[PDB]
Amino acid sequence: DDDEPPLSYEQHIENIEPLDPINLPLDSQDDEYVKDWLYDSRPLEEDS
Amino acid sequence: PRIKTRRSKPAPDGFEKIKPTLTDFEIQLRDAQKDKSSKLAAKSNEQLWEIMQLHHQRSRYIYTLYYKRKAISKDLYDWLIKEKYADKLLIAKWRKTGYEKLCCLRCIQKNETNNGSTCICRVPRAQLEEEARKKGTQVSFHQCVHCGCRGCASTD
Amino acid sequence: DEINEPPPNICEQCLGDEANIRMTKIPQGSECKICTLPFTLYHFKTSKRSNNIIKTLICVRCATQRNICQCCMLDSRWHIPIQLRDHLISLVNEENVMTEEAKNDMMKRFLSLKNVKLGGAQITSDPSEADNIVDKLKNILLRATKSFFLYNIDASIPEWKITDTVSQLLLSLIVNHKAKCGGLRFQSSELGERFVSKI
Amino acid sequence: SWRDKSAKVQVKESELPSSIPAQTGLTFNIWYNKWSQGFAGNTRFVSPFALQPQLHSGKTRGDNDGQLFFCLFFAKGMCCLGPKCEYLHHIPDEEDIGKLALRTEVLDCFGREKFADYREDMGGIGSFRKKNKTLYVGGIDGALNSKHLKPAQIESRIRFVFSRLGDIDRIRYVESKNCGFVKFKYQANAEFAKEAMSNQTLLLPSDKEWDDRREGTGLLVKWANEDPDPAAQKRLQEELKLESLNMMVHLINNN
Amino acid sequence: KIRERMLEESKRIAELQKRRELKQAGINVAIKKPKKKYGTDIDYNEDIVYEQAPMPGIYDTSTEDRQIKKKFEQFERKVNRKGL
Ligand SMILES: [Zn+2]
Ligand SMILES: [Zn+2]
Ligand SMILES: [Zn+2]
Ligand SMILES: [Zn+2]
Ligand SMILES: [Zn+2]
Numbered sequence: 001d002d003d004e005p006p007l008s009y010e011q012h013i014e015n016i017e018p019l020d021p022i023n024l025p026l027d028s029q030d031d032e033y034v035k036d037w038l039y040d041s042r043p044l045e046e047d048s
Numbered sequence: 049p050r051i052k053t054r055r056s057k058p059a060p061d062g063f064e065k066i067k068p069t070l071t072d073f074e075i076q077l078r079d080a081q082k083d084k085s086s087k088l089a090a091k092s093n094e095q096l097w098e099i100m101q102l103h104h105q106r107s108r109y110i111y112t113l114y115y116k117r118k119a120i121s122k123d124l125y126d127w128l129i130k131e132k133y134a135d136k137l138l139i140a141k142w143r144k145t146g147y148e149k150l151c152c153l154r155c156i157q158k159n160e161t162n163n164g165s166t167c168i169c170r171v172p173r174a175q176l177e178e179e180a181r182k183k184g185t186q187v188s189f190h191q192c193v194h195c196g197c198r199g200c201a202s203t204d
Numbered sequence: 205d206e207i208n209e210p211p212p213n214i215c216e217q218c219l220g221d222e223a224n225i226r227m228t229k230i231p232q233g234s235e236c237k238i239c240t241l242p243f244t245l246y247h248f249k250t251s252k253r254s255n256n257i258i259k260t261l262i263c264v265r266c267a268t269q270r271n272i273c274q275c276c277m278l279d280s281r282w283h284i285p286i287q288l289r290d291h292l293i294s295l296v297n298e299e300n301v302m303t304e305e306a307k308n309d310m311m312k313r314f315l316s317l318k319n320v321k322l323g324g325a326q327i328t329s330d331p332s333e334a335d336n337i338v339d340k341l342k343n344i345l346l347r348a349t350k351s352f353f354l355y356n357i358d359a360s361i362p363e364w365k366i367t368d369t370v371s372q373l374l375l376s377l378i379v380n381h382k383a384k385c386g387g388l389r390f391q392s393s394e395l396g397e398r399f400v401s402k403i
Numbered sequence: 404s405w406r407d408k409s410a411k412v413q414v415k416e417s418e419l420p421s422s423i424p425a426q427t428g429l430t431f432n433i434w435y436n437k438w439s440q441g442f443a444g445n446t447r448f449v450s451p452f453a454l455q456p457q458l459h460s461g462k463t464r465g466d467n468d469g470q471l472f473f474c475l476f477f478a479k480g481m482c483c484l485g486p487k488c489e490y491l492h493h494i495p496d497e498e499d500i501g502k503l504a505l506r507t508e509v510l511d512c513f514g515r516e517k518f519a520d521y522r523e524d525m526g527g528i529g530s531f532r533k534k535n536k537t538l539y540v541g542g543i544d545g546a547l548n549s550k551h552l553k554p555a556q557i558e559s560r561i562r563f564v565f566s567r568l569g570d571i572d573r574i575r576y577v578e579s580k581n582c583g584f585v586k587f588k589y590q591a592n593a594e595f596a597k598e599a600m601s602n603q604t605l606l607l608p609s610d611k612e613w614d615d616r617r618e619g620t621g622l623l624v625k626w627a628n629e630d631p632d633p634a635a636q637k638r639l640q641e642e643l644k645l646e647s648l649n650m651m652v653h654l655i656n657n658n
Numbered sequence: 659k660i661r662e663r664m665l666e667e668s669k670r671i672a673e674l675q676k677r678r679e680l681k682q683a684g685i686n687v688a689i690k691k692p693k694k695k696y697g698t699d700i701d702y703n704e705d706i707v708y709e710q711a712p713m714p715g716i717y718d719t720s721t722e723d724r725q726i727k728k729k730f731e732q733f734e735r736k737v738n739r740k741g742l
Contacts, residue, residue: 255471256514
């Protein structure tokens, strides 16, 4: 609504557990090497 | 990863023993960020001094568990650093030699100040007191600007 | 303009007794109270752990025209206000040397740009005539020398002299200076008998 | 004495007056905390608070630090910090005035900067070109809620109110015009008593509108002009002459 | 402009009439000034507004200064008492 102030993150948002993203379900053996990290934020941020 | 999402990992063993006490700091932080309206300026600094105190005490709790009395596993302590229950850099300053009672990380940053020097809470008390006794007035430093620190020297 | 601006003149009473000061230059800080025009404000502190921070308030044109400090507004030689300096210069050589003070915010920022050294600063901007008039001040100084009902109070003496003498001759005091009915009243009648006894 | 007890808190922080004042106009301005689309020519009210110089005054935090300046809100009657206030919480005496002497030439007793010329209506802070010591008390008929009170008693109440805020050189109440002229002995007492007794009342409990003193407007303390009384002018000239002789002595001794 | 000058003239006359009546009554209402239309609008009795000094020469002008100051002070006193 136009007259509603933007709701505070710390009260109305942060205490709610998030919901399910897109995440195409991968096969277990045809997609073996990329399955455990394909959908991370930075997929191999710590794998030297 | 302070919010708990799908990317997060489940907790190691000892966390359920120390889950309640950390919970106290959580609810106490949700009194501090709560917008109590104050007209003055010093009374609006008191709120930020309270927040920095609560963050310092939670980090001292996780530090005094893992390093001093060795009461939690290393595998749990890495999780507590990952999930931002602790400040890795402030604990890294606590592990040094001259810095153990350190308030916050803006009181040792030389770049922020006017002329070089750190915050005045880093001075020992007796050195300030002998300079104030030499000039004969009194020691006039009650409480710092950044933290509200009252003498966070290692000897004090 | 500001590519060659003169250094300030800060009174020696204002700078303090510490032999090393740091002062902050802000190239267009405040605007001048006499001159209405921007200048480079300086804000030092006397010792490092003093409580309050002295800052300059007037322009350097406005300070030089009156031959005064910037932090203090006092005459830079004799260390007295402008209004008493002009009285002392006016009382000796009889010129009415009084300083001219401009309203109408165009006129004050007009006057601040001319370079004339305003009224009584012409003498004390030079050490010679400033010492000559002190020599003349020597000559003028040489030619110079429970409730009580008071009555015949001098017409120009205030209440506090009466109270300070009674506190030496040892409350309330209501003195109407017109009718001279000095209705003094002590807090104890024993103190009334005390004051009756001492006189 | 006030050197013994620490300064009492005058009013709590929660019990302070709010901002967003009074609902005068229609729409509230944010950059300036005032009301717009409005009508306003009065905008005055009786101050709820007042200091009691024997009950409230005492030592504070920044008295051990030797601060020169006096608390503005101690004077006005609403200082909400008590023993923690940075500024002084007591009436200016000879010792405190003697320390301010380098700074009173430029700025106030409270530490505020004196402007070049007074105001259209002789407002708040002084002017640094003149050491004025006489205060104009006026608006007394609003200060008394229109209780006509036989003017010698009004002069007695103005005598008693300012007798606690310092030393008095002289008092005068004017018969023809509802005003009084109060000359203090030092300047800092005049500055303190001006900001301490603005927007106050003259009523005191046994006066039948003490429960109803809060309605009204309250009195005005401003700066007095020059006195056209020729006796006052000749007294001023004589006092100027004696000050001139004192400064002649000091300037000769500094050569 | 003709009409406005005549009307401002008669308005000033009425404004002085009421002051003279109150002066006879014994209450001296000072004359209010016109208001400024902008922030640095100049009043012309406060100061000599762009005062230029005549850049002194070789001759001496102290006694003539005193004689002028005497004459002007005496004229102002005479207008105050007797009224021009
Ligand atoms: Zn600290
Ligand atoms: Zn700190
Ligand atoms: Zn600090
Ligand atoms: Zn200037
Ligand atoms: Zn205070």
